[PDB]
From a paper:
SARS-CoV-2 main protease (Mpro) is one of two cysteine proteases necessary for viral replication and assembly, with analogous functional counterparts in earlier SARS-CoV-1 and Middle Eastern Respiratory Syndrome (MERS) coronavirus variants. SARS-CoV-2 Mpro is 306 residues in length corresponding to residues 3264–3569 within the large polyproteins pp1a or pp1ab (generated by a ribosomal frameshift during translation). Mpro cleavage of pp1a and pp1ab at the 11 sites, including autoprocessing sites at its own N- and C-termini, releases nonstructural proteins (nsp) 4–16.
Further, a product complex of the same substrate, captured at 2.0 Å resolution using a Cys145Ala mutation, is also presented, providing further mechanistic and atomic information to inform future therapeutic design. Possible explanations for this, which future studies may unravel, include allosteric communication between the two active sites within the dimer upon substrate binding or, alternatively, a substrate-induced dimerization. Mutation of the catalytic cysteine to alanine (C145A) abolishes activity, while the dimerization defective P9T (with native active site) lowers the catalytic efficiency by >50 fold. For both structures, the asymmetric unit is composed of an Mpro dimer with crystal packing orienting the C-terminus of one monomer (chain B′) proximal to the active site of a symmetry-related monomer (chain B). Capture of a well-ordered product complex in the catalytically impaired SARS-CoV-2 Mpro C145A mutant is clearly defined in the electron density maps. For the C145A mutant product-like complex, the C-terminus binds in the same extended manner, forming analogous main chain and side chain interactions. Well-ordered electron density unambiguously confirms the alanine mutation and presence of terminating main chain carboxylate oxygens. One oxygen of the terminating carboxylate sits coincident with that of the carbonyl of the thioester acyl-enzyme intermediate structure, forming hydrogen bonded interactions with the oxyanion hole main chain nitrogens of 2.9 and 3.0 Å. The second carboxylate oxygen is positioned to form a strong inline hydrogen bond interaction with His41 Nε2 (2.9 Å), again supporting a role of the latter in general base activation of a nucleophilic water to form such a product. In that context, the active site of the empty protomer in the C145A structure reveals electron density for five water molecules, including one not observed in the wild-type substrate-free protomer active site and lying completely coincident with the proposed deacylating water position in the acyl-enzyme intermediate above, only observed at even greater occupancy.
Numbering used by the authors:
A (entry chain B), B (entry chain A): 1 to 306
The structure:
């Protein structure tokens, strides 16, 4: 028993972290097979960030300008190319520690683990959610770019995020492993602002099901609702709309607990309109939106009577 | 910027997890050098589990009764002995993945990362605190016994916890790596109950310093306080008394932020008496006590590990 924000074991990803240096700029790279992936702003100086012409800066650099280090070993760069906002450095050696992996682009609301790194070395691991405004509420300092977000499926590592930068509100922006930013952000020093952040409704519902499994049922009511009706109320409280794919995803929890998804939507609707009145849910005064239905399922391990 | 419950990278510990089977009982073991450490209740059956005579059960078992597996490889057990509540199985092979390690006994208030395992395989990693009542508020299911807790400093893994069981309130009990339980608990099915839990004051102060570093400063006040005056208020809110050793421990953060410890104590005193009035600290409506002063330094300075 017990629920916790759990990250995946980081071992498979730690064996892929390298340090990439270009001039005086150092950040983290990801060594998979004979390729090192890293943010393209490694080729920039502080002055270049004001409006960098990346094609032009890359053209002026050669393989010898990249210093890739994997511990006390230098990796010889054989080729280099840019794919969107990521730099790919072909090295002469294939990483012997390369796990089974794939690159995936995640949707807002989905979670992943972050292995925060500095100088090619891991500092810590934590669980994050991709926000509806395409930012992440992470913990990153200068030198953390190149750090990746991932999930593990059996023994396959799915890389879904590479860190690039921090927005003025203290949230983080990055790309998938194909170099494409999540959201409307650019790797240029300009005034950028994240859109209005919204609550991940499907995860609040999953968390209300976790509370029901753990014995917290004060918020439950004998009422039901209709999908569009709920979405109109939720929209007013800055909650994301609940799609039919979200309802399908909540199916296993709904079946186990015997509480239909739309009955839980009516309980959430009452909570939004009346508040919690000093009461808590799972030892929390606020509704949690970074705990997915999958986490609730795998941590409960309950049976579904039919 | 940002502040998260951050676990240590688990890679070094993943290379030490093995599966230990004795009869029909299977749990996790810790393979360091030529020794496998695991809870002694692996030698028990469901019937033994009420009031087991461990000495007698161990006496009636031989090395051939233990099946130790490290992936698709069986490890030969050469010897076996009991040290308090842990079984030590000497194997014929030294773990080639043994990191630099030491066994430590931690104090209440201290945090560590838990690598939750099932059948010798890591499932997830999270950060825990040893509560003042010697329980941990973890996330464990049947088969998680033998999962360990650890901290890292420089390149040395300090193992401080091995999981054994769950108490009737849903909290968890375990031992240090010398087999001694944290708290007044025993490894059998008897009436056991955790004592009254309290808030780890020195950790709440460490977390208020983390908030200040991240620019969340609304709670700061012009008032200062005396130590006994603070303890007289904190005691009423079920907070642990702040000792002079705690003030000394908060010294580096106090110097790093320019805010005296007793100045922060007066801010906490106001927060306890008036509440947060709808405001949050580091996105939290409740005061967090599972970050020590070094957990804050480690994260906000970007300390990395081997």
């Amino acid at each position: 028993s017990g629920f916790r924000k759990m990250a995946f074991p980081s071992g498979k990803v730690e064996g892929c972290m390298v340090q990439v240096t270009c001039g005086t700029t150092t950040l983290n790279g990801l060594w998979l097979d004979d390729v090192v992936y890293c943010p393209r702003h490694v080729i920039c100086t502080s002055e270049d960030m004001l409006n960098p012409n990346y094609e032009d800066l890359l053209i002026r650099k050669s393989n010898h300008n990249f210093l890739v280090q994997a511990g006390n070993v230098q990796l010889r760069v054989i080729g280099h190319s840019m794919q969107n906002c990521v730099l790919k450095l072909k090295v002469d050696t294939a990483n012997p520690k390369t796990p089974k992996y794939k690159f995936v682009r995640i949707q807002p609301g989905q979670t992943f683990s972050v292995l925060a790194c500095y100088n090619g070395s891991p500092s810590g691991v934590y669980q994050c959610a991709m926000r509806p405004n395409f930012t992440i509420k992470g913990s990153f300092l200068n030198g953390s770019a190149g750090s990746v977000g991932f999930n593990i499926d059996y023994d396959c590592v799915s890389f879904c995020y590479m860190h690039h930068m921090e927005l003025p509100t203290g949230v983080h922006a990055g790309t998938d492993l194909e170099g494409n930013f999540y959201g409307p952000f650019v790797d240029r020093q300009t005034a950028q602002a994240a859109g209005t952040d919204t609550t991940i409704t499907v995860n609040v519902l999953a968390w209300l099901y976790a509370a029901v499994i753990n014995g917290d049922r004060w918020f439950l009511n004998r009422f039901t609702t209709t999908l569009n009706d709920f979405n109109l109320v939720a929209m007013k409280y800055n909650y994301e709309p609940l799609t039919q794919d979200h309802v399908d995803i909540l199916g296993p929890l709904s079946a186990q607990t015997g509480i239909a998804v739309l009955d839980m939507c009516a309980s959430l609707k009452e909570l939004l309109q009346n508040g919690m009145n000093g009461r808590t849910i799972l030892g929390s005064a606020l509704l949690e939106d970074e705990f997915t239905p999958f986490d609730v399922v795998r941590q409960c391990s309950g049976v579904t009577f039919q």
